[PDB]
Design goal:
Chain B: Catalyzes the decarboxylation of malate to pyruvate. In vitro, shows malolactic enzyme activity in the presence of NADPH. However, it is unlikely that this activity is of relevance in E.coli, which produces little NADPH. The structure is cut from a larger assembly and holds three copies of chain A. Chain A has nine helices and four strands, in the order H-H-H-E-H-E-H-E-H-H-H-E-H. By secondary structure, the first copy, chain A, is of the alpha/beta class. The first copy, chain A, has a four-stranded parallel β-sheet, with helices on both faces. In chain A, strand 2, helix 5 and strand 3 form a beta-alpha-beta unit. In chain A, helix 6 crosses helix 7. Chains in contact: A-C, B-C.
Chain lengths: 190, 189, 190
């Protein structure tokens, strides 16, 4: 591993502590290793102490989350770390070729179709129902049918919102590229 | 006393010590909702007052809009004030309008606007209304763990006078007496 | 030809008139055939009488026109009719595969690279200069560099406006899909 890897403390220190445990040289035994690893992590990331109730509650029953911006490197790293923590069941939107090629490029280990689902926005079997529902919602706000089809092809946020509305997902996290208010407007409208 | 000649407004300015250095905030006490012209005059007077301290002034106009990302009236008022200031004093280092972090941090500003005319970290911050100025000043005063200031410096009146607050300590009174003496040393303008 | 083809009168009647000319059975000879064909066309299309000065002036020196919406059937038909009249030198924006396939589907005769130019918006060698210029124009209106790149990839109207501004074209005709005011806003800003 490289020198600056942050996982070094979390992987090393508990192992050395357990080695001390076995050989009897310890003088202040720890009760359980879970709180120890938690404390080390709070040292590493500086927000675990604040977010611990949220993580603990969320780990009890993971849900389905849609990340429309499924080609950014940051989103892929977050998906890997979410799968590792066993904290959600991500769904990504984008072209499968680019996603797979970048996963290879960054050297991650999440496998499409096993750890997460890819929704090909350019060609999906549920395109008809999605754009029909979007039109049914937005027809009185100045959205023609052709505009609805164009939006369901070109705008990932609309696809995510429609997926959440129909009950095929449970939450959506968007907006890591582009302006805030366009995403907010789409979300509020849907 | 009345206003000094060539000016039609008065302002107040508070000093503060952040990790990025000394910083001035205006306007905090006088105008409730200044327009573009008042903002320009306040900026010029603040620049002169900062020059008194032997510092090279660097001004930033703050807003929630980030280089035209919004078109609410406040952002337009900032843009008009900026053009007025650039018309009057061409040698002053000023840019805007921008977010606070862009004003204080060089890298953030350079990422979004590589050719800005403002270098380093700004040391004068001009707010659109007294709400934002006062709230920011108080929160920064407490959060920047020192809790010490040099304010409020009053600019725009024809004689060297300042008005303090009831919670002012001895050291602040001494500092303002010294500053008023320095202002009065030269013939009042 | 099908019964409803509008070119039937224009192609037939002058030929029969010339046949009458040759055999000497005519009693009121026409001076030149051009005004005759013009009059027939004004019967066919109902606006030639109004637009004739414009067509006559434009035919003297064609210019370069950008149609950003280069995948619509109507735009392709208009391009064919413009090439036939020798009235402009069109430039289309879109994916070459779809454009060629639809040209085959509609049975037109315009050939890419000979009668008109195709600009592949998804991959163009001048992407860098285009998005750089767009950012240089719109940086103070709340457009970050990433937004500029995204716009030059996704918005054909911006590409057309930038092409016209740099002098690589002479006019632009847009707005046959979507709302009026978005196109107008882009045009006014540029």
């Amino acid at each position: 591993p490289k020198p600056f890897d942050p996982r070094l403390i979390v992987k090393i220190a508990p192992a050395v502590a357990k080695a001390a445990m076995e050989s009897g040289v310890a003088t202040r035994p720890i009760a359980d290793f879970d709180v120890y690893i938690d404390k080390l992590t709070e040292f590493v990331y500086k927000t675990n102490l604040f977010m611990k109730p949220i993580f603990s509650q969320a780990r009890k029953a993971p849900k389905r989350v849609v990340l429309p911006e499924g080609e950014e490197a940051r989103v892929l790293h977050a998906t890997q770390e979410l799968v590792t923590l066993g904290l959600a069941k991500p769904i990504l939107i984008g072209r499968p070729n680019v996603i797979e090629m970048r996963i290879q490029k960054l050297g991650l280990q999440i496998k499409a179709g096993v750890d997460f689902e890819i929704v090909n926005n350019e060609s999906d079997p549920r395109f008809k129902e999605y754009w029909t529902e979007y039109f049914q919602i937005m027809k009185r706000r100045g959205v023609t049918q052709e505009q609805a089809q164009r939006a369901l092809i070109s705008n990932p946020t609309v696809i995510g919102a429609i997926m959440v509305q129909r009950g095929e997902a449970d939450a959506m996290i968007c907006g890591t590229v582009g302006d805030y208010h366009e995403h907010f407007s789409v979300v509020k409208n849907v | 006393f009345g206003y000094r000649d060539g000016v039609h407004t008065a302002g107040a300015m508070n000093a503060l010590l952040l990790p990025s250095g000394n910083t001035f905030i205006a306007d905090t006490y006088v105008n409730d909702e200044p327009d573009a012209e008042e903002l320009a005059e306040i900026t010029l007077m603040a620049a002169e007052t900062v020059r008194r301290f032997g510092i090279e002034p660097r001004v930033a106009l703050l807003s929630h809009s980030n280089f035209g990302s919004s078109d609410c009236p406040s952002s337009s008022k900032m843009r008009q004030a900026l053009e007025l200031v650039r018309e009057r004093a061409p040698e002053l280092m000023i840019d805007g309008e921008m977010h606070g972090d862009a004003a204080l941090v060089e890298a953030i500003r350079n990422d979004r606007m590589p050719d800005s005319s403002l270098k380093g970290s700004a040391n004068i911050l001009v707010m659109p209304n007294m709400e934002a100025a006062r709230i920011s000043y108080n929160l920064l005063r407490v959060s920047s763990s020192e809790g010490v200031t040099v304010g409020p410096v009053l600019m725009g009146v024809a004689k060297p006078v300042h008005v303090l607050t009831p919670i002012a300590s001895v050291r602040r009174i001494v500092n303002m007496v010294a500053l008023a003496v320095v202002e009065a040393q030269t013939q009042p303008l």
